[PDB]
């Protein structure tokens, strides 16, 4: 199922997710809808809190042909180093892009779809992704990194863009 993705200035985007208590079949069809919703909207990452499910689940797929879906359940950040930035977007901030300061290298622990723990070292687009998504789980959006001025115009451009969404 495709779920509805919240946009700013929705206050539910600012909620701190709870850790998943147990990875069962309820959890695994949250993951599936999250992937289906992600691909439907053409994103490379989606956090549960964006679909108004406030638990610690992130799906990511950077792939061309969808051969390596990545699931992070209860992600914890073990180490980071370096610094980069690319011009990021977000399904919850429609059509806006900004350079956000990120760590370049990141080591995480997490559970997969089967509740088995794995560790992942990531750089590049992956490491930027993981950070952006993990931010969602604690109520942080990428525009939070920007000047008060930069934030204003973002908020307005989006409001205008939904002004049309609910369309008629
Ligand atoms: Zn996002």
* 81 CA to centre of ligand 1 in angstroms: 22
Number of independent structural domains in the chain: 1
Which among 40, 94, 27, 30 is positioned nearest to 66, based on CA atoms? 40
Residue 151: phi and psi, rounded to 5, are -70, -45
Q: Map tokens 């309820």 to a residue.
A: 26
CB 73 within 8 A of CB 112: yes
Q: In residues, how long is the chain?
A: 168
Given the DSSP bridges, would you call strands 98-99 and 87-88 parallel, antiparallel or unpaired?
antiparallel
Range of the domain at 75: 1-168
Q: To one decimal place, what's the resolution in Å? A: 2.5
Distance, in Å, from the CA atom of 74 to the CA atom of 91, rounded to the nearest integer, reads 21
Helices (H), 42-123: none
Q: Which residues are annotated as a binding site for Fe cation?
A: 90, 132, 136
- Please tell me the distance between residue 24's alpha carbon and the centre of ligand 1 in angstroms: 25
Q: Determined by which method?
A: X-ray
Binding residues: 90, 132, 136
CA dist 19 → 54, 111, 116, 140 (Å): 9, 11, 15, 17
Domain CATH code at residue 136: 3.90.45.10
CA 92–ligand 1 middle distance (angstroms): 6
CA atoms lying within 13 Å on the CB side of residue 121: 3
- The residues assigned a catalytic role are 133
């Amino acid at each position: 199922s495709v779920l509805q993705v919240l946009h700013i200035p929705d206050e539910r985007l600012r909620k701190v997710a709870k850790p998943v208590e147990e990875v069962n079949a309820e959890i695994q069809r949250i993951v599936d809808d999250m992937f289906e919703t992600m691909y439907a909207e053409e994103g490379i990452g989606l956090a549960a809190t964006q679909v108004d499910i406030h638990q610690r689940i992130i799906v990511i797929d950077v792939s061309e042909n969808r051969d390596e879906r990545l699931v992070l359940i209860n992600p914890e950040l073990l180490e980071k180093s370096g610094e980069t930035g690319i011009e990021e977007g977000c399904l919850s901030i429609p059509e806006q892009r900004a350079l956000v300061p990120r760590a370049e290298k990141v080591k995480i622990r997490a559970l997969d779809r089967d509740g088995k723990p794995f560790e992942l070292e990531a750089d590049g687009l992956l490491a930027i992704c993981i950070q952006h998504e993990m931010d969602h789980l604690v109520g942080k959006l990428f525009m939070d990194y920007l000047s008060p001025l930069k934030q204003q115009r973002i908020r307005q451009k989006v409001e205008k863009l939904d002004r049309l969404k609910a369309r008629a």
